[PDB]
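Form 12-C: Joint structure prediction
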Amino acid sequence: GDDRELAILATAENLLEDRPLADISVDDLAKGAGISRPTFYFYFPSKEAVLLTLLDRVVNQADMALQTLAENPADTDRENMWRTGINVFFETFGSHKAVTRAGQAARATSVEVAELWSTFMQKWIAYTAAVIDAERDRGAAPRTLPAHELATALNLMNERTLFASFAGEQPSVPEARVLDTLVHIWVTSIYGE
Amino acid sequence: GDDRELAILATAENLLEDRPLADISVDDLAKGAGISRPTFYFYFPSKEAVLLTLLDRVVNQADMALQTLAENPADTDRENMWRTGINVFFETFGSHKAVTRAGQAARATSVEVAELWSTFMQKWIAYTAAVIDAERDRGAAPRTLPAHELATALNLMNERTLFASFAGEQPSVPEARVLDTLVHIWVTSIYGE
Ligand SMILES: CC1CCN(C(=O)Nc2ccc(O)cc2)CC1
Ligand SMILES: CC1CCN(C(=O)Nc2ccc(O)cc2)CC1
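Section 2 - Result
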């Protein structure tokens, strides 16, 4: 039951590595999951709902990893603090490139996908701003831009930059350079005047 | 002739203020331009080609404004130098929000739109890196990240951040804050260690 659901989700993530959702049939999903078409429709209303669930899983994995880090202060300098945090997203989304690529595309055509991404971006921005504010309150960061506005632009930079790198877009930062690139921009913009 | 082409382009930019391209018919474009449907097809093969031409116009307007600025060094500090440059894009795309919004969306479904945007982003990144390199050669900026990689991430931040602001996305930087926000991140990341 739960196991036929997991098989459908696994089949979908596998087929998205090779082609876009548009080119994947419900037949392809049911065949890969070893069920019939009408059995598929018991578990999901459409191939679009499958992608929504895959993206929901990946986004919550990143969020839950960030929560784990927020509980356990890693014993490091300000640069390493931000690098470990950005790295949650680099590794989580980087480990699910096909779901990442298809989910970002679906935002255009799915209000549920757009709303999921929006909800988590607001959470990540809020957390970023809360850390910047703590750094200002302890005297480690200068009171420059409004923290929420700075957090918003930095999170949008990471969204666009990591997705471009993982998709191999032209232009993009090479994947093996993107973490250093983003950490430099975060640290200089948070701590600089 | 040229004037029926301009009427079609004007009608398209007007109708995109109120609805997406998907909800605009060739009938709507020909009616607004005061021509028949088959006359429309003399000037453009599809509503999609009209949008391509509108986006081509806006992108070249930004590029030509940046070229004008690159010829005429405005007599200012490093912060004002970058602000005037970012402002070309803020004003040019901000003055064509409907075409901006529809063009960014069309990148998903039009190889010509994706290629146009890619070509100009590569040009803007190359120019950004050339300015950073000049600033390093004159001793005004430190030799930190590879200039092309830094330029790439900063240009992708501006792409995503300006489009989110103009679309009123949640989340976004308010339009009246986005220029200050982006200038701060550019200057601190270019001149900071
Ligand atoms: C405390 C911070 C650490 C750094 N974080 C980010 O990297 N956000 C991020 C990454 C990739 C995305 O697509 C969107 C957002 C935010 C939370
Ligand atoms: C010398 C620089 C000045 C600042 N520039 C930018 O603002 N780029 C930019 C703006 C909006 C976009 O969508 C994409 C790129 C680059 C050229």
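Section 3 - Comments
The interface with chain B takes residues 105, 108, 118, 121-122, 125, 144-146, 149-150, 152-157, 159-161, 164, 169-174, 177-178, 180-182, 184-185, 188-189, 191-193 of chain A (CB under 8 Å). Residues A 85-86, 89, 124, 127-128, 131, 155, 158-159, 162 surround UAW (ligand 1) (CB under 6 Å).
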